Design a protein around this ligand. Structure first.
Ligand SMILES: O=C(O)C(F)(F)C(F)(F)F
Ligand SMILES: O=C(O)C(F)(F)C(F)(F)F
Length: 6
């Protein structure tokens, strides 16, 4: 699982 936020 992976996530990213800008
Ligand atoms: O996404 C993975 O690698 C996984 F192991 F299935 C999790 F359980 F972390 F979701
Ligand atoms: O990106 C990588 O090299 C990895 F090892 F999968 C981490 F777990 F750090 F995400």
């Amino acid at each position: 699982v992976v996530g990213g936020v800008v």
